[PDB]
């Protein structure tokens, strides 16, 4: 039928590196931009991406020796890889993180 929902879990936030750096992976509260703040994550993020300027998003296939996420953005484009890091949980963040944007990208 006609009704149409949004997500209203929690937003998954991620243990990561990016550019050999530790920090967290998150969206913004209004799920508009995806962001990447380095520990001990007090200050601005040094990455900020629009979902509407994320043309793609690419994984690493689970059992390879890193578990990471790959976006392009929206123009050689530009394209920023977050490895996960979590000892235990890392695919599992990666999946969460995954599951979400693309339900955001398609809609
Ligand atoms: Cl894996
Ligand atoms: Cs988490
Ligand atoms: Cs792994």
Known sequence: ENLYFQGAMSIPRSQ???KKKEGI???TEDRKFLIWTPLP?????????????????QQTP???????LK???????????????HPTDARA??????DLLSQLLAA
């Not at 976006?71 to 890091?85: A, G, S, V, W």
């Open 25 to 27: 992976l998150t969206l």
């Open 62 to 68: 689970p059992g390879s020796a890193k578990v990471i």
């Open 41 to 57: 994550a007090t200050g601005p993020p040094t990455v900020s991406l629009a979902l509407d300027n994320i043309t793609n998003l």
């Open 93 to 98: 963040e990666a999946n969460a993180i995954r």
């Open 71 to 85: 976006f392009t953005e929206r123009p050689p484009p530009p394209q920023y890889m977050f490895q996960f890091t």
């Open 16 to 18: 990561t590196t990016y």
